[PDB]
Amino acid sequence: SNPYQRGPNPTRSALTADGPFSVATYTVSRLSVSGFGGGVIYYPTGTSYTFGGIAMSPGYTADASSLAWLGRRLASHGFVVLVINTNSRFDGPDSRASQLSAALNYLRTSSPSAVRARLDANRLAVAGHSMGGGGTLRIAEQNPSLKAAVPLTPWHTDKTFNTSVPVLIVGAEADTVAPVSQHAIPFYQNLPSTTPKVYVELCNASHIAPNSNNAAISVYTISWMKLWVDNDTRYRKFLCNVNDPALCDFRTNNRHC
Ligand SMILES: [Cl-]
Ligand SMILES: [Cl-]
Ligand SMILES: [Cl-]
Ligand code: NA
Numbered sequence: 001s002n003p004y005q006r007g008p009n010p011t012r013s014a015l016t017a018d019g020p021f022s023v024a025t026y027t028v029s030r031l032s033v034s035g036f037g038g039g040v041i042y043y044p045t046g047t048s049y050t051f052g053g054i055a056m057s058p059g060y061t062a063d064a065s066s067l068a069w070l071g072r073r074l075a076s077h078g079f080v081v082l083v084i085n086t087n088s089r090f091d092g093p094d095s096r097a098s099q100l101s102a103a104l105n106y107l108r109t110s111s112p113s114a115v116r117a118r119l120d121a122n123r124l125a126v127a128g129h130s131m132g133g134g135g136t137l138r139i140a141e142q143n144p145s146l147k148a149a150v151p152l153t154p155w156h157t158d159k160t161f162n163t164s165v166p167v168l169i170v171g172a173e174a175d176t177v178a179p180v181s182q183h184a185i186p187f188y189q190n191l192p193s194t195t196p197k198v199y200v201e202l203c204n205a206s207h208i209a210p211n212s213n214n215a216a217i218s219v220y221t222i223s224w225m226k227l228w229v230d231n232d233t234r235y236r237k238f239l240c241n242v243n244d245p246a247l248c249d250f251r252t253n254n255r256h257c
Contacts, residue, residue, distance in 0.1 A: 004123065004230040006049055006078040012238065015222050016215040019077030022046040026112055030085060033110070035102025037085035039064045041111060042075035043118050052123035052147065052229035053080045055103040057096045059130025059210075060155070060177075061089045066211045067129060070221065073213075077222050079229070080119040082107050093134025093156045100126055100139045123147055125229050127221065129210040130155045130178060133169075137187060140165040148228035150221050151187065152210040153178055159186040166196040166256065168224040168239075170217055172205035173248045180249075188251060196256045198224070198239060201249035216246040227256060 007020050021044040030038040044051055054074060058066045064083040071083040084103045086096060108121035125148040128136040133154030140149035140163040149163070152170045155178035171184030178184065180201060188199040200220050202209055210217055219238055226235040240257040242250050 002231055002233075004052070004120075005232055005234075006051065006230065009234055010226075010238070012219060015077075015219040015238065018073060019222075021076055021078050023072055023075045024114070026115060028082070028106070028111075033102070033106055035106070036099035037087050039082055039084035039103065040068065040071060041080065041082045041107070041115055042071040043080040043115050044075060044078060045118075047118075049078070049118070050120040051078050051080055051118055052125060052225070053104070053107050053119050053121060054082070054125045054127060054225065054229075055100045055107065056081060056083045056126070057086070057100055057128035057132025057135050058083070059128070059132050059153075062129065062211070063089070069213050070210070070217065073218055074222065074225065077226070079225060080107065080115060082111075091131075093131045094138050096128065096132050096135030097138035097142065100128070100135055101143065123229050125149065125225055127152065129153060130207065137161045137163070137167070140167065148224055150224055151184075152217065152221075153184065153207050154187055155183050156187070160190040161187065162192060164192065164195055166224065166228045167191055168198045168200070168220060170210070170220060171199065171201040171249070172207060172209045173201055173203055174205060175207045177207035193253060194255075197253055198256070199249065199251040200247050203246060203248035216244065
């Protein structure tokens with residue numbers, strides 16, 4: 001059952017480190033693509049399977065290298081992951097949405113053949129840090145064919161996204177760039193009631209928490225991607241009956257359980 005299932009039955013411990021797939025990397029040069037600033041593709045190798053794809057945006061003033069750990073982490077668990085650079089480091093969230101959109105098209109149609117050979121372009125998702133997370137929400141509303149969206153410490157001046165795409169938001173309790181009371185939490189609250197949604201808040205974390213190896217970010221991001229991109233219900237257990245000392249808030253409409 002479940003043609004999209006990949007990898008062994010997950011343990012929490014396994015979700016805090018790189019997963020069972022070898023990872024190859026491909027540099028998309030800034031100049032080779034119109035529509036976004038290039039970036040890095042992390043993707044499985046040594047395997048004949050195909051996997052869902054993820055496009056991921058860094059945050060305000062940041063480089064793709066800021067999320068290299070997470071692009072590798074996700075790919076190692078069985079995903080083709082393009083972390084973009086933006087046209088300008090100063091691009092705001094809706095610009096970043098457009099670039100995510102361009103990056104998804106690139107992955108499906110123009111990436112190298114070794115990358116295309118590993119991708120099932122019918123199963124795509126988005127993620128992003130900060131302002132890139134605001135772009136993640138925007139694109140999830142503009143393009144409901146996406147399977148999942150994971151905004152990390154998100155920032156956006158618009159607070160309401162009417163998307164049917166399953167959303168997991170990571171807030172940081174001590175975030176002073178994108179305070180959870182103005183940003184992360186309104187975003188969660190204002191999503192449709194009928195959309196599967198989860199909000200997790202990291203205790204004692206700032207806005208820069210996504211920029212380095214983080215166990216909670218790893219577990220929840222992998223789990224939400226597996227659950228919806230792969231329909232992999234083996235990951236429901238990390239997202240249901242949650243009791244996690246790493247978190248200082250948790251909210252869900254429990255449609256995913
Ligand atoms: Cl092969
Ligand atoms: Cl913008
Ligand atoms: Cl197409
Ligand atoms: Na500008």
